[PDB]
Write an enzyme that holds these catalytic residues in place. Structure first.
Site, PDB file in Angstrom:
ATOM      1  CG  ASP A 176      15.048  24.658  40.817  1.00 43.99           C
ATOM      2  OD1 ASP A 176      15.306  23.782  39.864  1.00 43.99           O
ATOM      3  OD2 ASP A 176      16.260  25.208  41.393  1.00 43.99           O
ATOM      4  NE  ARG A 207      26.672  30.837  44.792  1.00 45.79           N
ATOM      5  CZ  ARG A 207      26.137  30.756  46.418  1.00 45.79           C
ATOM      6  NH1 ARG A 207      25.274  31.378  46.900  1.00 45.79           N
ATOM      7  NH2 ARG A 207      27.562  31.816  47.181  1.00 45.79           N
ATOM      8  CG  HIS A 254      26.537  32.525  37.904  1.00 42.17           C
ATOM      9  ND1 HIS A 254      26.285  32.822  39.468  1.00 42.17           N
ATOM     10  CD2 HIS A 254      26.482  31.175  37.934  1.00 42.17           C
ATOM     11  CE1 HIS A 254      26.153  31.329  39.593  1.00 42.17           C
ATOM     12  NE2 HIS A 254      26.653  30.414  38.805  1.00 42.17           N
TER      13      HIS A 254
END
Ligand SMILES: [Cl-]
Lengths: 398, 394
Positions: free
Chosen positions: B263, B302, B305
């Protein structure tokens, strides 16, 4: 617990309406409203905490899809009957068909629109009310444009002006949300003829809701008209159109319309005489102001409809005090307003907060009684209308 | 026709009534068909003016919730029992008339309960908003950040064009806040837990599907013994690391230590502060090339989108370049049906305010093929639209 037998009564209420609509039997308004409330009450009891928040979020997106599709005339491009492809809708309005599809999909999921197959759309009974610029579509337009931004500005507004009831024409939440808190709502709206025009049409959609003629017995006024051939009969304080005076004198011809007085702002009265038939019988047109004395003395009936809710208790006492001063001993004042129950219903509580953005409020009968009593008046009776809390409060001099 | 729809709903309420009397859960399908129908009956019974009123109330109800939360009104209401409006007002030092009018909104909607003429009390629908939790954070987010973007959309399309909004620049959100030249995440980096409110709130839209009981990871464990040094599962944008530990506790011979959590550096630093056995932690930007090469499985959940089709093509393209011929990419996303459900359509327009969108399996197949991949299969959630799209190098 107690949540279990709420569902049982709504169930029984649903079976009763089911057999009723099977027999084609008419449904009284109070039964309609009870079913409307019962359906919504159960939806909150059945929803968990996450589903409630999800529902609130969908209504936001749904209102946004309605507003955009109204502005872009997408509903108007869809035929009132039959289907039409998304691409055809997009060509009629000259808009990206993804945007049309994604926004229409919102209204398909909520049942406002119905999708046919993979790419064709059609109107439903819930979307045709928005297939044109009309009284109801205007309400959605001004609701989204003129009141929702004020709701958003409320946390910052109460930080700026204090956590108190907003009252007064200046420093309204609406004006604060526009960035010009020193301007009144009318000054902001006068700067745009389109925004004014939509509000005019939207407000005219609500003045028409609960008629006074037919629900109030004017037969005693007929006796007063005969005894005194010259005293004024009905005075409509802030009557805007004159619509109410025409209805009252048409149903009770004993009251000649020319013996009644229509009172409003000079700019509003100018519109009335501009569009009226000069050769027809018309009430007296009088340009006035709420804050000054009532010019018509000793009239039989004074009407003040949908006005007191725009002002604080203190302003209302001044307004009512001028009426009480001009009224005779046998005069009657009819206050036409929503009368909040305690606790109030959903549509009236919603209206109460919307009124807060412009310096108004709705009131219970207790709050009306205090304001009425402080103006030298007393409540004589209340005429509540079917299927709602809009009422005509009959008042008389103390 | 219309009559028996009322009877079917009535019968569902009968079935629901006895079960909540006994503290029974009722089948989820039966709960779903009761929430629907209750909506459909409202759509048939409501007049057009009443349906418009329902929609306007939702905005006023969220505003009453927001104000009473900010003013510590839910904190001043006792846990059990009732309290007068005058007492609530005195505890929070606010005009009792203002307290009463806003609470009347929640009383009318059922969030709060009024006892008698002047006393109020908590319910099961008000208690979550008395504390700091994902649900209360989300509703605050919906008011403070999503709502201004929705109201600004008529004006936004008047200035940028009535076309699909795309990209991280000139978003509706940045437009609504008066700084259209800012990107959404620069806006969230304004204050450190303005972003922290966001990451806590995304646990309310956290309809969690565990993936471990959805995808068979046993073949991955066989690869672990055949190549002792190969990376196993790379979680791209995994944020928490919850998904990785769930998969490894549920699949034997798939050690967490041979998996990588990837991340943003600032997110990875928060993870290391709150963590302690563990996967590899790698600060990264998934818009640039993927450092961990040849992993058996790459996960991206997730994330897609939030971005336009072309940006997702670049994101997936970096993963495709790093994948081996036997590697697998699992895309965890909502797969839109045509027409979509209420929550997926609602989330679709929210994502439009940041330049993203929800996608069908066709739209996914288009962007997947542009990155050098093909769809091998889809593992779908039952009772929802969340799916795992299994992708391999084309
Ligand atoms: Cl699409």
């Amino acid at each position: 617990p107690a949540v279990a037998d709420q569902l049982d009564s709504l169930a029984a209420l649903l079976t009763s309406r089911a057999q009723a609509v099977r027999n084609g039997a008419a449904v009284p308004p109070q039964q309609h409203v009870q079913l409307v409330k019962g359906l919504k009450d159960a939806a909150g009891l059945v929803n968990e905490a996450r589903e409630d928040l999800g529902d609130l979020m969908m209504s936001f997106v749904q209102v946004t899809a309605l507003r955009l599709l109204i502005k872009w005339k997408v509903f108007e491009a869809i035929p009132l009957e039959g289907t039409i492809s998304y691409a055809d809708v997009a060509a009629r309005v000259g808009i990206d068909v993804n945007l049309i599809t994604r926004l229409s999909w919102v209204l398909v999921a909520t049942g406002v629109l119905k999708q046919d197959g993979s790419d064709k759309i059609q109107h439903t009974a819930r979307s045709r009310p928005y297939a044109s610029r009309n009284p109801l579509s205007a309400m959605m337009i001004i609701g989204f444009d003129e009141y929702l931004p004020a709701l958003l500005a409320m946390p910052g507004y109460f930080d700026t002006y204090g956590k108190k009831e907003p009252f007064g024409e200046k420093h309204t939440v609406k004006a604060f949300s526009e960035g010009n808190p020193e301007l009144t709502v009318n000054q902001i709206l006068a700067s745009s003829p389109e925004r004014l025009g939509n509000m005019t049409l939207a407000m005219a959609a609500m003045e028409n809701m609960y008629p006074l003629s037919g629900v109030y017995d004017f037969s005693w006024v007929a006796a007063k008209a005969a005894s005194d051939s010259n005293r004024p009969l009905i005075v409509d304080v802030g009557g805007a159109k004159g619509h109410t005076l025409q209805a009252i004198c048409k149903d009770t011809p004993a009251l000649p319309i020319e013996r009644c007085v229509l009172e409003d702002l000079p700019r509003v009265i100018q519109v009335v005489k501009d569009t009226s038939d000069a050769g027809a019988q018309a009430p007296q047109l009088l340009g006035m102001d709420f804050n000054q004395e009532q010019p018509v003395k000793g009239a039989v009936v004074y009407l003040i409809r949908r006005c007191l809710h725009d002002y604080s208790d203190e302003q209302c006492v001044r307004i009512l005090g001028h009426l009480a001063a001009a009224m005779a001993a046998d005069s009657v004042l009819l206050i036409g307003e929503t009368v909040l129950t305690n606790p109030p219903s959903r549509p009236t509580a919603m209206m109460d907060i919307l009124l807060a953005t412009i310096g108004g409020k709705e009131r219970t009968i207790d709050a009306f009684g205090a304001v009425v009593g402080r103006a030298g008046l007393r409540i004589k009776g209340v005429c509540k209308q079917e299927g709602g809390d809009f009422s005509y409060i009959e008042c008389v001099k103390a």
